[PDB]
mmCIF file of N, CA, C and O in Angstrom:
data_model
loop_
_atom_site.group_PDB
_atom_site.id
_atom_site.type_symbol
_atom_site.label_atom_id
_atom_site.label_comp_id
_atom_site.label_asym_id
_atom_site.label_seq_id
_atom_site.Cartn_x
_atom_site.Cartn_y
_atom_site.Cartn_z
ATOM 1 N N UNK J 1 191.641 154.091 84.149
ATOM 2 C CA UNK J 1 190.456 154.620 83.487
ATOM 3 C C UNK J 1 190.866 155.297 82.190
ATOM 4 O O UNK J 1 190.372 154.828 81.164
ATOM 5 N N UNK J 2 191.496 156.080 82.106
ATOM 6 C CA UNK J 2 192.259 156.868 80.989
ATOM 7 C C UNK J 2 193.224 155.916 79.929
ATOM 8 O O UNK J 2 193.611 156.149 78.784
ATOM 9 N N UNK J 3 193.422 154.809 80.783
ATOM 10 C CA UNK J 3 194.032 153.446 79.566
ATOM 11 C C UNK J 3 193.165 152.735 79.055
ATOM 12 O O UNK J 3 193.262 152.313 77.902
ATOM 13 N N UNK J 4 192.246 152.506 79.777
ATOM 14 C CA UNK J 4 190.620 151.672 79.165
ATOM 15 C C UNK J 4 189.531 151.879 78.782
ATOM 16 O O UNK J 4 188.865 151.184 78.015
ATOM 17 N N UNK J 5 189.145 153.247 79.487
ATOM 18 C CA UNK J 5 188.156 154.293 79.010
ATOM 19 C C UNK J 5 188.263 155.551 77.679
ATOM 20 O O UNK J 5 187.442 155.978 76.868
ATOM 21 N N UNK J 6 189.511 155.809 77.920
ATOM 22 C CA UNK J 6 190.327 156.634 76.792
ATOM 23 C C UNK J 6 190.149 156.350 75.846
ATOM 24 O O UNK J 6 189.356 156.955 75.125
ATOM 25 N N UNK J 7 190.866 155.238 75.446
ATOM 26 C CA UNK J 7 191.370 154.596 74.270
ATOM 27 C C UNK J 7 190.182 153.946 73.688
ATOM 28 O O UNK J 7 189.570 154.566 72.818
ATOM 29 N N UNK J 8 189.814 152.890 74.016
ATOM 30 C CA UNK J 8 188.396 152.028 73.379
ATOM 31 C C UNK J 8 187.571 152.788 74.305
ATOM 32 O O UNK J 8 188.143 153.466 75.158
ATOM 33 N N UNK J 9 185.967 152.758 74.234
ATOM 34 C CA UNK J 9 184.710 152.993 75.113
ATOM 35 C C UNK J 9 183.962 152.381 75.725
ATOM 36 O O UNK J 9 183.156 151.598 75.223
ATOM 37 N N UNK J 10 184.084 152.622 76.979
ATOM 38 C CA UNK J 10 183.580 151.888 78.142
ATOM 39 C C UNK J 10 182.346 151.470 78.269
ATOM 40 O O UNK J 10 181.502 152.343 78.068
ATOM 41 N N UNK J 11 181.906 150.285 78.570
ATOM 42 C CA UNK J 11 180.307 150.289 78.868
ATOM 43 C C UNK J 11 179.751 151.090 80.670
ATOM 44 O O UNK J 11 180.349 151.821 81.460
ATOM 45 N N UNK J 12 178.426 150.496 80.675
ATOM 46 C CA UNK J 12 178.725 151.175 81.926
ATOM 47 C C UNK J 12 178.810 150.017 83.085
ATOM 48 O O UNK J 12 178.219 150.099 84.162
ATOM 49 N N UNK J 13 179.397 149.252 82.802
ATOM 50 C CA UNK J 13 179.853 148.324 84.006
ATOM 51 C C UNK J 13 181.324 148.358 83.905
ATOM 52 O O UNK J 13 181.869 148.084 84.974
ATOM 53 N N UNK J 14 182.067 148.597 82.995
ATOM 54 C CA UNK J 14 183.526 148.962 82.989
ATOM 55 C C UNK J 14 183.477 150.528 84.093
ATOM 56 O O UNK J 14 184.210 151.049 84.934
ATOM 57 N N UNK J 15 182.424 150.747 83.587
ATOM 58 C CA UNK J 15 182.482 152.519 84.579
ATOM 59 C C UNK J 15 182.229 152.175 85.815
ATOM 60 O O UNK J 15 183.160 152.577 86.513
ATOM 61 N N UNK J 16 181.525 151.694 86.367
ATOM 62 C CA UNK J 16 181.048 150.672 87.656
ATOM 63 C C UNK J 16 181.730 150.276 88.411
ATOM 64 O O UNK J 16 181.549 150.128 89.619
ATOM 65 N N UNK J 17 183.023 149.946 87.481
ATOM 66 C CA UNK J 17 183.928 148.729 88.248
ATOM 67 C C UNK J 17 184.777 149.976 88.796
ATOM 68 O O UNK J 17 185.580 149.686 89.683
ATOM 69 N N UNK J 18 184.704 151.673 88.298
ATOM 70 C CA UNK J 18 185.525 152.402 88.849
ATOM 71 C C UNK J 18 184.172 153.074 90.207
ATOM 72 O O UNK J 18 183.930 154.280 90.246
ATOM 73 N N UNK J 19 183.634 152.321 90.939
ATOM 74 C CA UNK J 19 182.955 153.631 91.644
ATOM 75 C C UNK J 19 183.114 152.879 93.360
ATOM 76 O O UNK J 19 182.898 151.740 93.772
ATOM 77 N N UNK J 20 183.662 154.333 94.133
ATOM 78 C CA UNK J 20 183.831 153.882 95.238
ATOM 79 C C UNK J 20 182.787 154.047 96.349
ATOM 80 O O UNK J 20 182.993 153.573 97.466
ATOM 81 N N UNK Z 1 194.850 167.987 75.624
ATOM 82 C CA UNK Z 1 194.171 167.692 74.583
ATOM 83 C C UNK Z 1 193.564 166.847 74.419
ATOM 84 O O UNK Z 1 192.800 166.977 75.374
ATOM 85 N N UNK Z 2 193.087 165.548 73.673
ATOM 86 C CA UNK Z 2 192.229 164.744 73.633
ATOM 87 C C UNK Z 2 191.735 163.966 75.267
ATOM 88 O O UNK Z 2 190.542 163.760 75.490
ATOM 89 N N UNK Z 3 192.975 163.545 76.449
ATOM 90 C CA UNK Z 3 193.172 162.985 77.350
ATOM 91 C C UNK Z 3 191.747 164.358 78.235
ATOM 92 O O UNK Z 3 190.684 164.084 78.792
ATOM 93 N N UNK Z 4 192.224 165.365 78.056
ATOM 94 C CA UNK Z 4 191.395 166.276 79.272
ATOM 95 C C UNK Z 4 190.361 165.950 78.810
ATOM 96 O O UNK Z 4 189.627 165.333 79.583
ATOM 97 N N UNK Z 5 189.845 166.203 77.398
ATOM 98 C CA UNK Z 5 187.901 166.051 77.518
ATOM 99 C C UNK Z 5 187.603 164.556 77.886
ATOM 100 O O UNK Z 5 186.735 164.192 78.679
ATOM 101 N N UNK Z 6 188.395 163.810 77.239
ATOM 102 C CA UNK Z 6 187.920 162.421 77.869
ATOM 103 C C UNK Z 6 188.168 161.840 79.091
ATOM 104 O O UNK Z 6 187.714 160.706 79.247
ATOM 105 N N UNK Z 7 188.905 162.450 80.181
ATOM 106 C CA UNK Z 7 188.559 162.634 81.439
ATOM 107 C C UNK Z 7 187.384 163.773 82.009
ATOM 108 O O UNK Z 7 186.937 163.600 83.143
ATOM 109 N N UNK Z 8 187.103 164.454 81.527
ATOM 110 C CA UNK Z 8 185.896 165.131 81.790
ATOM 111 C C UNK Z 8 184.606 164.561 81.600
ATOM 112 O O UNK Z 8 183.660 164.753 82.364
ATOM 113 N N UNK Z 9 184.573 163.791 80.475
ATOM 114 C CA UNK Z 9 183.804 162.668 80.220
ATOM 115 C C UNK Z 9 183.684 161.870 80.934
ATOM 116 O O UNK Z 9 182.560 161.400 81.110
ATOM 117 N N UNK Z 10 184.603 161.468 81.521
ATOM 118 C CA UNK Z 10 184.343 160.240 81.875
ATOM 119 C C UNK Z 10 184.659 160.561 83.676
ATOM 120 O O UNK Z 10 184.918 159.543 84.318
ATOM 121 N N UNK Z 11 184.645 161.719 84.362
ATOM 122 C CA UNK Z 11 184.222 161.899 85.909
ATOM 123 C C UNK Z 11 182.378 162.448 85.722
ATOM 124 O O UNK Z 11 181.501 162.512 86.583
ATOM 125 N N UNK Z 12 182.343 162.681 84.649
ATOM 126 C CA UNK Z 12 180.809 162.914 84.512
ATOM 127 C C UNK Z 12 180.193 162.197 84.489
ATOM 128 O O UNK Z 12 179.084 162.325 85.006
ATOM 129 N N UNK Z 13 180.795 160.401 83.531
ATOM 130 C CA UNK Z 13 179.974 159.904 83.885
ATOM 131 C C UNK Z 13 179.994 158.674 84.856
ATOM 132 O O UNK Z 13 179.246 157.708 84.704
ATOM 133 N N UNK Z 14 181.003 158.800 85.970
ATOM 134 C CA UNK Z 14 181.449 158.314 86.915
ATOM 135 C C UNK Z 14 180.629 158.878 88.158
ATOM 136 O O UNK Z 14 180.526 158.348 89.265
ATOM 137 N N UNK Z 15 180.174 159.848 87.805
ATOM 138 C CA UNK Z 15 179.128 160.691 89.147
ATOM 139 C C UNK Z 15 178.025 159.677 88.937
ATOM 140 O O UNK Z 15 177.864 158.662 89.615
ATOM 141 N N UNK Z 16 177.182 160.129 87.775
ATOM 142 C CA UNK Z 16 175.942 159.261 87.499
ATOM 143 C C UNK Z 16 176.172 157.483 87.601
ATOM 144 O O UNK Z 16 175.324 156.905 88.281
ATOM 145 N N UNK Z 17 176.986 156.836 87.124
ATOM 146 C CA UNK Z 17 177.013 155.555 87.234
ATOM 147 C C UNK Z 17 177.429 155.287 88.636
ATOM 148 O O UNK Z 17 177.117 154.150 88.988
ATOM 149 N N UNK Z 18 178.068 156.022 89.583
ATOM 150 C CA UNK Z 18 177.982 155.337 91.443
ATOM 151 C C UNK Z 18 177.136 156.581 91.827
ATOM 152 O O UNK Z 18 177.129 156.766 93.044
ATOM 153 N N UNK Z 19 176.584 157.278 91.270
ATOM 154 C CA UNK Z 19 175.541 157.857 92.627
ATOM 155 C C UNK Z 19 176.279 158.780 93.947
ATOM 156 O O UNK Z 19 177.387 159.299 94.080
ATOM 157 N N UNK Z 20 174.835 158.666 94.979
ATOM 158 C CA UNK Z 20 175.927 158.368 96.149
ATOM 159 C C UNK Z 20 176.965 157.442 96.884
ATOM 160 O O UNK Z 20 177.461 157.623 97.996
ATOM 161 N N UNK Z 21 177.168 156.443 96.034
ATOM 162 C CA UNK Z 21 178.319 156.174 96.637
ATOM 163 C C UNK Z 21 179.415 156.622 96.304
ATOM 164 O O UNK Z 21 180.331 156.141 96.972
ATOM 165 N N UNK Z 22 179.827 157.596 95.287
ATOM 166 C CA UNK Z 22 180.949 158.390 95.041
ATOM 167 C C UNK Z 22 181.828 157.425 94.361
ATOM 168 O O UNK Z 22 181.699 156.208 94.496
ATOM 169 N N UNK Z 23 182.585 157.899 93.743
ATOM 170 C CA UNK Z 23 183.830 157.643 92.564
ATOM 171 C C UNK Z 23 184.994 158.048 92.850
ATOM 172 O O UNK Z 23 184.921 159.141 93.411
ATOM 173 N N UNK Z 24 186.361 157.577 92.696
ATOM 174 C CA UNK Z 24 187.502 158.008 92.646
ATOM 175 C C UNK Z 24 188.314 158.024 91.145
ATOM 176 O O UNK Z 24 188.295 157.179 90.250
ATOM 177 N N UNK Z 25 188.940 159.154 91.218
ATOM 178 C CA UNK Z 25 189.434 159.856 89.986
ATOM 179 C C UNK Z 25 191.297 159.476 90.004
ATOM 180 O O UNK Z 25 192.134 160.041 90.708
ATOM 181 N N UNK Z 26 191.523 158.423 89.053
ATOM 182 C CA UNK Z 26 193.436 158.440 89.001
ATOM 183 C C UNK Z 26 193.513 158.305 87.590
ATOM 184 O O UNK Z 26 193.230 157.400 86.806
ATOM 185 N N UNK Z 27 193.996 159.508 87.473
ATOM 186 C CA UNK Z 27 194.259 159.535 85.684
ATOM 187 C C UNK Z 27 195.669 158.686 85.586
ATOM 188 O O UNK Z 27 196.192 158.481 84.491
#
């Protein structure tokens, strides 16, 4: 998250793909 | 520095985008 979210900006299905 | 707010950012908006189904946090 902090390598892909960090750096460039996430949509919210990149955020999605982190939810448990 | 830059890394903490944008993990703060981004468990904030890890709450709202799963809800109740909850999120896990690995910096």
């Amino acid at each position: 998250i902090v390598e892909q979210c960090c750096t460039s900006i996430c949509s919210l299905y990149q955020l999605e793909n982190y939810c448990n | 520095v830059n890394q903490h707010l944008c993990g703060r950012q981004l468990v904030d908006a890890l709450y709202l985008v799963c809800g109740e189904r909850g999120f896990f946090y690995t910096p």
